[PDB]
Symmetry: C5
C-alpha cells in the first residue's frame, strides 16, 4: 500500500481513475443543458467514462496491492465500452437517416471482436493467433464500414459539423484504437513475438484508455455545443 516515487504505473492509474470519474460527472451533469434529441448521445458517452471510472478504481487498488495488472482484466471494461462507442456511430447519423440494421451490425461486430479478443487472451492462448485473426477481421470490417461504408455516405449526405465530428471518430478508431491490437502482439505467443514482445504497455494502456474515451466524449459534446449555438 506504500507509495513509491518511481511508480509511474501507479501514477497513471490514479490519474486515469480521477479523470474518468470527472468526465463521467461532466457528461451526466451537462446532460440537462441540451435540446431533447442530443441528450441520449451525451448520456451514453458518460456511461462509457462511468464504467471505466469504476473499473479503473478497482484496478488502481489492485496494482497498489499486488503490483501487477493482468491484461485480461481490462477486458471486463472493454467488452462493455467498445460496443457503446460503436453505438455512438448510430446517434450521430440518426438525423441523417440511419437504420437500426446499421446499429445491429455495429454491435454484432464490436461484440464479436471483443469476445474473440477475450478468447485469444484468456480462454485459449495456444490458438491465440487465430482468435487474433478473427478479431482483426472484425476490426477491419468496422474501420472499413466507418471510412468507406454506408456510415460515411450518410455523413457526407448530412454534411456540416455532423460530418466533421464523424471523421474525428474515424481517426480515434483508426489511430486511437490501434494500440490495443499492438498490445495483443506483445501479450500472446505466435509469429509476432519478435516484432512486438516484452514492451511495458501498462502506462500506455492507462494514458490511451483515458484519452480514447474522454476524447470520444469531448467530441460528441463539441458536436452538441456547435449545434446549439448556431
Amino acid at each position: 500500500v506504500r507509495l513509491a516515487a518511481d511508480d509511474y504505473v501507479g501514477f497513471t492509474f490514479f490519474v486515469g481513475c480521477m479523470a474518468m470519474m470527472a468526465a463521467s460527472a461532466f457528461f451526466f451533469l451537462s446532460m440537462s443543458s441540451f435540446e431533447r434529441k442530443w441528450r441520449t448521445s451525451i448520456l451514453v458517452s458518460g456511461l462509457i467514462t462511468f464504467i471505466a471510472a469504476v473499473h479503473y478504481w478497482y484496478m488502481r487498488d489492485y496494482w497498489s496491492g499486488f503490483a501487477e495488472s493482468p491484461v485480461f482484466f481490462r477486458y471486463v471494461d472493454w467488452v462493455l465500452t467498445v460496443p457503446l462507442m460503436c453505438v455512438e456511430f448510430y446517434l450521430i447519423l440518426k438525423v441523417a437517416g440511419a437504420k437500426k440494421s446499421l446499429m445491429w451490425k455495429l454491435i454484432f461486430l464490436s461484440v464479436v471482436m471483443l469476445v474473440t479478443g477475450y478468447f485469444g487472451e484468456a480462454v485459449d492462448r495456444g490458438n491465440a493467433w487465430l482468435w487474433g485473426l478473427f478479431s482483426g477481421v472484425a476490426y477491419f470490417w468496422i474501420v472499413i464500414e466507418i471510412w468507406f461504408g454506408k456510415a460515411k455516405k450518410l455523413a457526407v449526405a448530412a454534411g456540416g459539423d455532423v460530418l466533421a465530428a464523424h471523421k474525428t471518430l474515424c481517426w480515434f478508431v483508426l489511430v486511437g484504437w490501434a494500440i490495443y491490437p499492438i498490445g495483443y502482439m506483445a501479450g500472446t505467443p505466435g509469429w509476432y513475438d519478435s516484432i512486438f514482445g516484452g514492451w511495458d504497455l501498462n502506462v500506455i494502456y492507462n494514458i490511451g484508455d483515458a484519452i480514447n474515451k474522454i476524447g470520444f466524449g469531448l467530441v460528441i459534446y463539441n458536436l452538441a455545443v456547435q449545434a446549439t449555438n448556431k
Copy 2:
C-alpha cells in the same frame, strides 16, 4: 485474492455487475428524457437493474472471497425483481385500460412462485419436488395469462407498437426465464437428474440475469422512444 485468467465465473460477475450498474444509471438518467406518462415504467425497469447491480456487487465480492456462489443467495434478488417485471405488464397496458386486478394477480403469482422456489431450495430440500411443482404451476399460470389471457387481448385492443413490445416480453418470459426452472433441476435431488453439458450454471446465471433484465429495460425504453417520436 488475486484474479486468474481461467476464472470465467469471476469474469461474468464483474461484467454483469458493471453492465447492471450501467443500465441502472441509463434508465435513471433517461427517466427525465420522456413525458410524464412513460416515466414510471422506465423508473421501475431501472429499479430492477438497480437491485441486481447492488446484489451482483455483493455476490461479485463473495465469489472473489470464497470462490463459491450459493444458489439460494440469488433469491435475495429474484424475489424482488421477478415481481417488478410482472408489474411491467400492467404499466404497458395501463393506457389501454388495464385493471389493478390484473396487476395484483400478477404480483401475487410472481411472489408465490419465488417464495415456493425459495422454500424448495432453502428450508425444505427433502420435499423440494413438490415446491418445484407449485412454483411450476405458478409459472404456467403466468405464461398462460400473458400468452392467451386478458393481457394480450388488451394489448391487441390498443394495437400497434404496444402489442409488438408485449409479444417480445412474452418471449423473454417464455424463453428467457426457462433457464431458472432448469437450474433448479440441476440443484436438487429427485426424479430429475438434469445435468446437461459441461457448462457451469453460475456462468449461465450471470449472463442470463443481465440479458433478461437489460432486455426488459431495452424493450420498455424502445416502446417509449417509438411512442414519443411519432
Copy 3:
C-alpha cells in the same frame, strides 16, 4: 462471514435492506412527476425508507459479523422514522384543514413513545414495565386520535380518496404496528411472558419493518396518483 441456507434472519436482512434501498430510490425518483403540493409527502416517505435502508445495511453487516441483532439498536431507526410516519397524517389532511398543533402533538406523542421504549429497553430493565405502560399510553393516544379524534373528523369532512387512504393508514397503525409492543413483552421482564414460540422475532421484525414502511409509501403514492389523474 460465509452464509448458510438455514440462516433465515440473514436472508431477511438482505432482502429488507435491498427492498428499502429500492423503495427509497423509487420515491426519490418519482417525486418529480407530481404537482408541487404532493412532492413533500412523497419525499418524506422516501426519507423514511432511506433512513431504514441505511440502518438495515448496518444491521445486515452486524448480523453477518456476530450473528446477533440487539433489539435496542433498532431504536436508532425507530426513533427517527416513527415520528415521520405520524407527520404523514398531517401532510395528507393539510389540504382538509389540519392545524400544525395536531402535527406537533403527533410528533410529541411519537417521540415520547419511542424514548420511553428506549428507556425501558436500555437504561433500566427493572423498571421496564412502567416505561412500557407510558409507551403503551402514547400508543393508545395515537390510535384513539387517528381513529375517533380530530384527524378522522377532518378526513371525513374532506372525503373521497383522501379519506380512504387515511383509513388504510389507521389499519397499518392498528395492525401493522401491533407487532412492536408484542416484541417488547418478549424482550423485557415483568408481568407479561408473550412466548410466541416457533417464529423468530428478528425475522418478524425484518419482514414487518419493510412491510410497514413500504406500505405507508405505497399508500401515499396511491393517494397522489388517484388524486392527480382526475
Copy 4:
C-alpha cells in the same frame, strides 16, 4: 466494535449521524420545490447538515473503535459549519437589503471565534483562558450584532414572517450555542474549573449538535413554505 446497551454516547452518535444524513437529503431534495431566491438558503442549510453528517459518520466510527471522542476533533466540523449558519443571517435578510460588509463581518467573527477556540484547545492549553476570552468576545459581538445590531433593524424594517424566523435563529444562537462555551470550561484548566469542571458533554454535544443544525434547517424551510403559500 461490539455494541453495548448502556453505551449512550454510541447511541447518540448513530442517531445524530442518521438524522443529519436524513435532513441533508431532505433539504437537497426539497431545494427544487421553491422559487429561485429561497433555493440558495435551503441549499446552504443542507450543506451544513451534510458536512455534519459526514463528520458525524467519521466520529461514530472512531468512538466505536477507541471509545473516546476528542473535543478538538469536533472543530473540524464547527470551523466549517458555524460560519455557514452566520451566512444564513444574510440570506434571510436579503429581502430587505443586507450589505456584503455584514456578510464579511459575520464570517470574520465566526472564523476568529472558532480558530481562537481551536488554539485554546489544541496548541496552548496553558494560555487557554486568554484564547477563551478572545473567542468569548467574538461570540458576544455576534450575539449583540444579531440581537440589537444592524441585523435586527433590517429584520424589523422587513417585518412579517421574515422577522419571526430571525428571532428564533437568535434564540438558537443565544440558547442553543451556549452549551459550547460551557464545554470549553469543563475541558481546559483555568479560573472556571471550579464552576464547570469534570463534566462529560459528549452526549450533550451529540444531541445539541443535531438539534442546533436540524433546527436551523427546519426554520429556513418553514420560512420558505410560509412565504410561498401566501
Copy 5:
C-alpha cells in the same frame, strides 16, 4: 490510527477534504439555478473541487496511516485541476469572443508546467533544476498571458463584472499559486536550497489548496450571481 491534538497536518487534511466536498456539492447543486450559458462554467468549477475532494480524501487517509504525505502524490490532483482552472479563463471570456486557440494554448501551457514539475520531482531529481526552469517558464508565460496578453485585452474590451472577476483570478494565479514554485525550491537540491530549504509545507499546502480552489469557485459563482440580477 489514533490522532493527536497537536497534529496540525491531520487537522488541515480533514478540514480541506470536508470543505472541498462541501464546495463540490454547492456548485453541483447550484448549477440548475442559472441560465443555460453559465451552467458549464459552474459545473467545471465544481468538477475541480470534486477531483480535489476525492484526492484529499485519499491523502487524508494516507497521512492518518503512515504520517507522511509524499509531494509527488499531490501531482495526481494538480495535473488534472490546474488545467481546468486555465479553462476557466475560456468560459468567462467565451461570450466576450474568446477563440478556442486561447483555450488550447492555456491547456498546453498548464499541462507542460505540471508534467515538467512531475519530471523534476519524481523521475529525474539530479536534473531537477532544468525541469524547474522549464516549468517556471511555462508559469511566467501563463502569468504574462493573463496579465498583459490577449486575455486581458479581451476582458477590458468586454469590461464590467467580467473584467473584475478576471483581475481577481489573476491575483489568485499571481499570489495564490506562488506557494507551489516555492515548495519546489524547498523540495529539490539546486541553487535555491539556501533561500528555501528544510521548510515544512504540508500545512501550507493543505490551507492554500483549499483557499485557491474554493476561491476560484466562489469567484465564478459570484460572477454568475451578479449577472442574473439585471
